[model samples]
Target chain A: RIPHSFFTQWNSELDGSVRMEDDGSREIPCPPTFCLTDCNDKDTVDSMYKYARKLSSLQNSSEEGPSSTLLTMIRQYMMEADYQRVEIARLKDSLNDKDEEIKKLRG
Target chain B: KVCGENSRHIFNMILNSQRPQFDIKDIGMFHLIDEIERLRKLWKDSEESKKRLNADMREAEEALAKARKKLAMFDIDVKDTQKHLRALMEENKALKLDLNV
Candidate 1:
């Protein structure tokens, strides 16, 4: 199942690039600035959403097991978060050093 | 001799003038200030981008955690339901054996 708010927002932003396949699956293109570069495309984004939908279905089911794709996605998200935290800390430290240098120069 | 004296006087006057002098020190200072401003702007942009990425990362982390919890709960529910079904089937078999006796 598509995320309610995300699908709605995506549809609004997509002028004519989004294609709805006959099988009910969507072919949504990722925005150019969605990542650094070459991060996502139509196929990958669709596959990601497909895995997400499967995970959601498993969450609602009492007899189904989660697929490996879902587990991998979860792990990747956590990893990405970890990386972001590290980078943010590093940048903060750099900025603080720059601030101190500027202060010393001004004095 | 007069010309040399006049030249010396002119040199001294120029040296003692109060006008703002642009020299190597001024050029270096100007470049230093320009670089600092550029760095300050870059740092601000970096900080803003970092803030945005941090927020996104947090949201993603929370979503991942929620998904993991739901999956775990669902697995437990499935296991419990399967155990209950097995017990019910065993009891039903016993009842059938007794009823046919």
Candidate 2:
């Protein structure tokens, strides 16, 4: 079970630290501002679960520590990294197609 | 627009311990920086008030001590004057002089 206890109000850049639990759940300390944690909160829980999974997948990853505004800005902006990669691919395809059309027109 | 409030909160919390070196770009960190400065102001204002209160309290304490010392001096000085007058009377009797004043 996901430890609902940890997120009484917590984060990756946190008011408190995070611990990787034996149960594969992240032991996140609560946030000073607020927190959203409920078993009934399916969307919230699922997202957190995915995030915890991602963090552990890496080596894991500040206030006096972190600039949360900077954190959110970075996280939010590249919000859709994979989608952008696909988008770039599609744009290149369109570019190649347009160049072919231009050559045919010249012929 | 798909900013995760929960995610941001967690990100800020978990990564809040150590400052990392990712010197890159900042997009919408304005609101975050904006609020951080607000908190700095909050602490600044609060400490300012505390300092004022402490100084005010210290002055009052000094005044209380001074006032008490003055009161004690007044009482002791009055009693001392009475003792000195009695000694003067004794001296007059020994010299056979009349105690007029």
Candidate 3:
């Protein structure tokens, strides 16, 4: 969607190999950076979308037959990652609580 | 190994605090140690997962090796089945010859 908007805004600037766009008539900004790079770079939009697709499929199902122990292990990793995220939140709360107590003691 | 530096300081503060002795555990120190233990257990669990992943990889490799041999056996079975089919055809031809006689 953002890409479509970008292309729309830079419609007049669409030239091969390079583009030029003016924020205002008096001030032309640097040559328009190609959105195509982000769209096509190996680890940019394409890779992220591909990785997300893999993650979604992994979350759902991959193997066609009966579930194996490897599937269970992958599920376990997902659970562990969840637990770690929760632990981080819990620790942040604890630190904030301790900091409040320290301020009270100082006062 | 010691916990994080911040945790160590908290541990020191708890140890240094002069309080009335009792037969019960201190709640603050208990919470801290419990969190530490939880983290330690998670680390051990990750290690075990690493081991299990390696073992699964080995199992998959061995299964592939066996599958290769099974494929070869399947090829031989196809040849054997064809031979049996030809033998049956020859028997049928002989029976037809006797019938004509």
Full-model lDDT for every candidate: 0.59, 0.58, 0.58
Which candidate order results from sorting by TM-score in descending order? 1, 3, 2
Off by over 4 Å in 3: A1-107, B1-30, B87-95
lDDT of 3 by residue, B1-101 (tens): 22344545644554444222421133243344345445556766787899899999999999999999999999999999999999999999999999999
Question: Which TM-score value belongs to model 3?
Answer: 0.28
Output DockQ, candidate 1. Answer: 0.00
lDDT of candidate 1 over A4-53, digit per residue (tens): 99998898889568775575232323322211223223344444444444
Model 1's CAPRI class? incorrect
Error of 1 at B21 (Å): 9.3
Best by lDDT: 1
Q: Which stretches of candidate 2 lie over 4 Å from their true place?
A: A1-107, B1-29, B80-101
I-RMSD for candidate 1: 34.4
Give one digit per residue, the lDDT tens place, for model 1 in B1-101. 22344445644564455233434234353354345445556766787899999999999999999999999999999999999999999999999999999
lDDT of 2 by residue, B62-86 (tens): 9999999999999999999999999
What is the DockQ score, from 0 to 1, of model 3?
0.01
Best by TM-score: 1
Residue B84 lDDT in candidate 2:
100
Report model 1's TM-score to 2 decimal places: 0.33
